[PDB]
Paper text:
Laccases belong to multicopper oxidases, a widespread class of enzymes implicated in many oxidative functions in pathogenesis, immunogenesis and morphogenesis of organisms and in the metabolic turnover of complex organic substances. They catalyze the coupling between the four one-electron oxidations of a broad range of substrates with the four-electron reduction of dioxygen to water.
The structure of the blue laccase, a multicopper oxidase from the white-rot basidiomycete fungus Lentinus (Panus) tigrinus, involved in lignin and xenobiotics biodegradation, was solved at 1.5 Å. It exhibits a molecular architecture organized in three sequentially arranged cupredoxin-like domains; each of them has a greek key β-barrel topology, strictly related to the small copper proteins like azurin and plastocyanin and common to all the members of the blue multicopper oxidase family, like the ascorbate oxidase and the mammalian ceruloplasmin. The structure is further stabilized by two sulphur bridges, one between Cys85 and Cys487 from domains 1 and 3 respectively and the other between Cys117 and Cys 205 from domains 1 and 2 correspondingly. Exposing LtL crystals at pH 8.5 to high X-rays radiation doses under aerobic condition allowed us to detect two intermediates in the catalyzed molecular oxygen splitting, most likely corresponding to the 2-electrons and 4-electrons reduction stages. The electron-density maps from LtL disclosed two different T2/T3 cluster-dioxygen arrangements in the two laccase molecules (A and B) present into the asymmetric unit, possibly corresponding to two different reduction states of the oxygen molecule along the reduction pathway.
Numbering used by the authors: 1 to 498
Write the structure that this text describes.
Amino acid sequence: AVGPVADLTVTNANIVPDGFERAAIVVNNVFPAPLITGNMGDNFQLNLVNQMTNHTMLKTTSIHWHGFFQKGTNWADGPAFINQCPIASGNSFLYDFQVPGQAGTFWYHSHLSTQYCDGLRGPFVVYDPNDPHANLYDVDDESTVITLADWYHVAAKLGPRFPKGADSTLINGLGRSTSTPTADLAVISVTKGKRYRFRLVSLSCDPNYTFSIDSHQLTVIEADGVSTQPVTVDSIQIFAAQRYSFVLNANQDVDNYWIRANPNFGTTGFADGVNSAILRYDDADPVEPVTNQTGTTLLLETDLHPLTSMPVPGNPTQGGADLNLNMAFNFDGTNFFINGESFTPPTVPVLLQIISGANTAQDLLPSGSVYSLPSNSSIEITFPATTAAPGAPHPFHLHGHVFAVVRSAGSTSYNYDDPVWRDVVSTGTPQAGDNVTIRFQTDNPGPWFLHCHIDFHLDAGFAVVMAEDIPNTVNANPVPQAWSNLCPTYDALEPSNE
Ligand SMILES: *[C@@H]1O[C@H](CO)[C@@H](O[C@@H]2O[C@H](CO)[C@@H](O[C@@H]3O[C@H](CO[C@@H]4O[C@H](CO[C@@H]5O[C@H](CO)[C@@H](O)[C@H](O)[C@@H]5O)[C@@H](O)[C@H](O)[C@@H]4O)[C@@H](O)[C@H](O[C@@H]4O[C@H](CO)[C@@H](O)[C@H](O)[C@@H]4O)[C@@H]3O)[C@H](O)[C@H]2NC(C)=O)[C@H](O)[C@H]1NC(C)=O
Ligand SMILES: *[C@@H]1O[C@H](CO)[C@@H](O)[C@H](O)[C@H]1NC(C)=O
Ligand SMILES: [Ca+2]
Ligand SMILES: [Ca+2]
Ligand SMILES: [Ca+2]
Ligand SMILES: [Ca+2]
Ligand SMILES: [Ca+2]
Ligand SMILES: [Cl-]
Ligand SMILES: [Cl-]
Ligand SMILES: [Cu+2]
Ligand SMILES: [Cu+2]
Ligand SMILES: [Cu+2]
Ligand SMILES: [Cu+2]
């Protein structure tokens, strides 16, 4: 692990995580990117050193630290053309921020076009030295982080605009494709009698995964950075960019057990050990499992509740917030729309537009994609599922905030008492008549992206910007010189160096 102070050097390399070799983007020479760690409240000084050469996978980059509120450091949040211009190859840029009040399981990824799919993605864990759940487990370290990643044999800018599924599922960077049925599988080691805090991180560009471990129950204790009341289940469905911690008690026989991560589409099931890894007890032989799934209980989001009381902003009725927004989805075969408008990156990043003086949603580009939020207010946003936006279930993500999921996918109820707080939520399906509904309070001035975290959909415009407390965006987020220099440098590049 690296951090809280570290250089992250981004290069291109040929890698073979599923036994097939392809050109990719790696960080500190590895895919997934290395685990970054620190403790609650730490100052992260993460110096991104960009050495990429491959124009097809994009030579410039910008990094988002997923789930961190970035209060007062909106310029460090990462979305290209929202919070910064991209960093040029041959240059470095220091992300310098703090994580007060947060501890949990996070990740980081390129936030320029679909670049994270080509490899710039990895896990990020912030430990709590006084973790209230510490008594539930014995081991919590780099060996208990479990990443899930969809992997494509053809690069993001070379394959279909909307891929049909991934070629392999990688668990801790390893997995099999149908064409590589003997590729090395990841091994997660446990010792009989010990309890483990496994930190499950979706690095997905698109599919959700139904995750389980043969013969072992999973006690979920955290969702998207926020500690929850414990819930014991057999399987977890984890959407793109979500995170869970669960406790596993290694109380079965010394043996090998399959870890299963079944995507919603693509190559499904487990023939020849695709979509699989190995839970290997110490003292077991180094062979593949032959275990079966026995689980029957899939985690419901409605059974997730915060460990500490987190009251829901606003009145306990539909439309009961100070500002109530609905996000109406559409699609034209190529581009996605929200309330009739498709997100194309503006030339000038939204934060720099505001610094220059834009002070209404309507003076901000792209046209009709930016929403002004008043400060110190409760906000309700609904994301009704609709057949007008193919690719459901769309997992939506709000930057700068956690939010209360008052109504979850697959449920018709509204919980204003103790809903889960998290940062990525499935918006469900039109068949179920879903109308996923979130609440949050505006205490964090800055433009914050709100978008589907299926990266192919984001790149096709499925996004809006929450311009929170416009009058104090500049006051709250003083910018460093290096940030002010990004756009002039970027805009002076040849297009082939983008
Ligand atoms: C900057 O980054 C980019 C993006 O990462 C790099 O792009 C790469 O460019 C190369 C050259 O244009 C592309 O090559 C194609 O490579 C594939 C696969 O190579 C081969 O595997 C073959 C086996 O057949 C396949 O089985 C695999 C699974 O094993 C399946 O994935 C696949 O569908 C086939 O069934 C084997 O025959 C080869 O010897 C090699 O191992 C080739 O299939 C493909 O071949 C052609 O297809 C084209 C049209 O697409 C056609 O013209 C040919 O006649 C033949 O049918 C190409 O050779 C890579 O796919 C690109 N990589 C990615 C990830 O998209 C770029 O190289 C990089 N720049 C630098 C300087 O490094
Ligand atoms: C909310 O109100 C408090 C007290 O008036 C003020 O300190 C704070 O800056 C306000 N929050 C925002 C985001 O404007
Ligand atoms: Ca292309
Ligand atoms: Ca036995
Ligand atoms: Ca036994
Ligand atoms: Ca527009
Ligand atoms: Ca204010
Ligand atoms: Cl703190
Ligand atoms: Cl806030
Ligand atoms: Cu993210
Ligand atoms: Cu984010
Ligand atoms: Cu989507
Ligand atoms: Cu984002």
